[PDB]
Amino acid sequence: TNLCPFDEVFNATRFASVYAWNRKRISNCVADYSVLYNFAPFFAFKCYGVSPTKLNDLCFTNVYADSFVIRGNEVSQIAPGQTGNIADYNYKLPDDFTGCVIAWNSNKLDSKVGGNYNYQYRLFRKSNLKPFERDISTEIYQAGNKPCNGVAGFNCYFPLRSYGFRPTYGVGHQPYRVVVLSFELLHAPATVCGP
Amino acid sequence: STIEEQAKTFLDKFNHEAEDLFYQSSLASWNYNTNITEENVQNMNNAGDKWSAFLKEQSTLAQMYPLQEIQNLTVKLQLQALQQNGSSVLSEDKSKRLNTILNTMSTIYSTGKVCNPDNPQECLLLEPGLNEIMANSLDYNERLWAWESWRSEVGKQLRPLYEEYVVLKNEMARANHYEDYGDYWRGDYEVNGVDGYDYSRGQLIEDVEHTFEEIKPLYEHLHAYVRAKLMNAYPSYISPIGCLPAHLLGDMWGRFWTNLYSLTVPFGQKPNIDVTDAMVDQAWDAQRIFKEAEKFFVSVGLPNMTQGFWENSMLTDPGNVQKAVCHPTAWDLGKGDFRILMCTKVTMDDFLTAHHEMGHIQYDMAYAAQPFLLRNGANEGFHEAVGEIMSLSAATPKHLKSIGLLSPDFQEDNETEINFLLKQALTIVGTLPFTYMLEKWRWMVFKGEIPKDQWMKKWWEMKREIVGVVEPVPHDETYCDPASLFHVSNDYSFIRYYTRTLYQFQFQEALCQAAKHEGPLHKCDISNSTEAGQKLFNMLRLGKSEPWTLALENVVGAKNMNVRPLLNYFEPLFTWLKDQNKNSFVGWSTDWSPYA
Ligand SMILES: *[C@@H]1O[C@H](CO[C@@H]2O[C@@H](C)[C@@H](O)[C@@H](O)[C@@H]2O)[C@@H](O[C@@H]2O[C@H](CO)[C@@H](O)[C@H](O)[C@H]2NC(C)=O)[C@H](O)[C@H]1NC(C)=O
Ligand SMILES: *[C@@H]1O[C@H](CO)[C@@H](O[C@@H]2O[C@H](CO)[C@@H](O)[C@H](O)[C@H]2NC(C)=O)[C@H](O)[C@H]1NC(C)=O
Ligand SMILES: *[C@@H]1O[C@H](CO)[C@@H](O)[C@H](O)[C@H]1NC(C)=O
Ligand SMILES: *[C@@H]1O[C@H](CO)[C@@H](O)[C@H](O)[C@H]1NC(C)=O
Ligand SMILES: *[C@@H]1O[C@H](CO)[C@@H](O)[C@H](O)[C@H]1NC(C)=O
Ligand SMILES: *[C@@H]1O[C@H](CO)[C@@H](O)[C@H](O)[C@H]1NC(C)=O
Ligand SMILES: *[C@@H]1O[C@H](CO)[C@@H](O)[C@H](O)[C@H]1NC(C)=O
Ligand SMILES: [Zn+2]
């Protein structure tokens, strides 16, 4: 039997910034969802379109796992039909979403004395973001009428900013790791099935 | 892209760059105030320089979005708070001279030393020393010696500095489209915009005068009582129809009359309520005090304290290992970090100060959601008025019996109530005339009503007319008496104490009405009243986002500063004093002088 690789997704050494979030296509393997119940402190285990109990005996074609690191106050922005800075410029979920959202605290790993400046998030974008879209552009944001011409100054800002994680911040400003599961079923034959 | 959108984007960038820089400055300052090391001071100074540079650079950028173009009443408040120039409007030479003058006044106040006659090997500083002589000594010539010395050496060394300080602080204000430096100070109370809730900078003088015209009877009766009780300690120095000499008020300047309780106690056989020995015999520590305060706050509906509060806060004196600054402070480092620095001791005083500081911290926790530039109190007097009322409810005998620190068979006699009320009045009521006098004098000096050669004359004419205190020896134009006070030599506002005193009793009366308390107002406790906690939280969460006229209405029901609640707090004392002063003279004459 070949178990699905949910181990290397949840328990990775390093994660990715929100604006460039990883995606793994978990396919053609049997998936045991009892492994996910490890890591007992879960700040959120909200599930949409399914129920956690019966998730085993209902099997699909492709499963996508998306991972990134946000702050605590923004965990509520990874529900369908929400509005905010992260949900509009960084990661957007469709209104008809099916799947689960998992978030757990990672203060002891992602916060250092002096600051962890390797996690970044987008602050300025021209228009909103269509569902499941990834933008890694770093062009200068033009907020005025005078062309920027690839520099920064009056009404010409740098789109990406950096978190300042420290081991002394509050619960709302401490790092959190989020993994989002998307279940796709289609007329193409179903492959990923449980026990 | 209109101007408003550009302003919103600029504010969004500023709000992210300011939080980080301010957090690094605040953490450096905390580390300096906990330890003491040459390295920690250097780190503090570097972080402070970085923060000051960031603010200096950003104000120039904000002066490119015209103020009239924006109609949001929230972006305008934040941009206005960035657009102040300060002392940058002046030329470089004048700015350097002003900074030098301020530094010189501070360093001449800080290390002022007076020497007794014909004995150079014995000289005293301000603290300790002269503060102990005028707080515990019953000799007359000993107090007058210190009072004259302090204004002879230190007082006379500041007037030439003070004149140029005034003339230079008027130029900065006039370059900022004000009338004088006095109007600049009155800008903390200005509300422009929202209809009905408007307050002008000139209305504050009228409001203060109207409120002070009502406190005069109670102050007169207190003054007559203290005068009657002071003739028995200095038999042949105080006139029964005159004014109190300025050096017999328990302090160098007469700001507080607390140290007169020994001489003016109504009933000396019955002692006050002290729970210091009860706490020790129950084996209490600092942690117990702070958990009791937290339990008090949760009953009214306010939230708990953060898990970081119990880990990153100092609540005990470290000892000989570390050198710390033992001053009770409440810190809001930003980004969810809340701490308290306090060298807690087992004493009722620390028991009350814990409630006070926790009230500060709760107010800080309330407005964490607002933008950075709107994370302060409604005005300069709301914060510690909110902090103070929590200590009033923690000292009432009803609260102490509930927590068990006081015996359950103790009965409240009506003779200790007068003691408590008089002790409170000697600190709260005896300082309002002094505050009003000093602020009026400073306002008139800046405007130009008092000429340069009639400063001390009008200063001592106002004291014989408002406060009721006369000078012991004559003073002329070579003296600078007001500069002898800390808040005058150092550029500080002073009306905040007056406003706070009037606000706290309004808040207390509103909460006691909401808590369905029947009886005298000074026995009030807002414990176990969830309604009285929602009402306060309806004001604590706003910050500066809304005018202070509206925030007051969310608690008290009125939209202006009022004095009747203060008088309802002192009704029994007022009646007792009216009964006690039936065979004495109430009032004073502005002709008698000790040197006459
Ligand atoms: C605040 O309330 C607590 C809880 O008491 C209960 O709730 C009150 C609203 C009221 O309905 C009480 O009758 C309830 O029992 C009080 O704590 C109790 O105080 C009584 C005093 O008679 C004591 O016998 C109990 O052991 C206490 N229970 C505890 C400590 O868990 C508290 O005294 C109230 N404080 C006030 C009124 O100031
Ligand atoms: C703060 O100072 C700056 C200049 O140091 C002021 O900006 C000037 O305002 C005058 C007023 O008419 C203009 O003529 C100038 O063009 C402005 N710029 C400069 C570089 O001088 C600014 O107004 C001051 N702030 C306030 C609130 O008055
Ligand atoms: C997570 O990875 C670490 C390191 O490989 C391992 O020790 C730990 O057991 C893993 N956790 C789980 C739940 O497998
Ligand atoms: C600050 O105080 C702690 C407590 O003893 C000490 O360990 C530390 O060395 C001090 N800081 C410095 C820079 O010495
Ligand atoms: C002012 O701008 C803020 C933007 O956060 C908006 O929420 C608010 O409604 C605006 N005020 C008015 C009166 O529209
Ligand atoms: C505050 O903390 C105590 C113990 O930590 C807990 O019992 C109580 O429910 C908390 N209050 C709230 C409002 O969560
Ligand atoms: C207190 O109560 C006694 C009891 O009769 C009464 O005589 C007295 O006037 C009251 N007031 C004071 C201040 O003692
Ligand atoms: Zn305080």
Numbering used by the authors:
A (entry chain B): 333 to 527
B (entry chain A): 19 to 614
What does the report in the manuscript say about this coordinate set?
The trimeric spike (S) protein is the major glycoprotein on the SARS-CoV-2 envelope and is responsible for engaging the ACE2 receptor for viral entry, and thus, it is a prime target for vaccine design and therapeutic antibody development. Receptor-binding domain (RBD) in the S protein plays an essential role in ACE2 receptor recognition, and mutations in the RBD affecting receptor binding and viral infection have been reported. To unravel the underlying molecular mechanism of the S proteins of Omicron BA.2, BA.2.12.1, BA.2.75, and BA.4/5 bound to hACE2, we determined their atomic structures of the S (BA.2, BA.2.12.1 or BA.4/5) or RBD (BA.2.75) in complex with hACE2 by cryo-EM or X-ray crystallography. According to our previous reports, the binding interface between RBD and ACE2 could be divided into two patches (patch 1 and patch 2).
Compared with BA.2, BA.2.12.1 has extra L452Q and S704L substitutions in the S protein, while BA.4/5 has extra △69H-70V, L452R and F486V mutations. In complex structures, all S proteins of BA.2, BA.2.12.1 and BA.4/5 (N658S) exhibit a three-RBD-up conformation. N487 in the RBD of BA.2 and BA.4/5 interacts with both Q24 and Y83 of hACE2 through H-bonds, but it only forms an H-bond with Y83, and its interaction with Q24 was absent in complex structures of hACE2 and RBD of BA.2.12.1 and BA.2.75. Notably, R493 of BA.2 and BA.2.12.1 forms a salt bridge with E35 from ACE2. An additional H-bond between T500 of hACE2 and R357 of the BA.2 or BA.2.12.1 RBD was also observed. In this study, we found the binding affinity to hACE2 was also changed no more than two folds regardless of substitution by Q452 (BA.2.12.1 RBD) or R452 (BA.4/5 RBD).
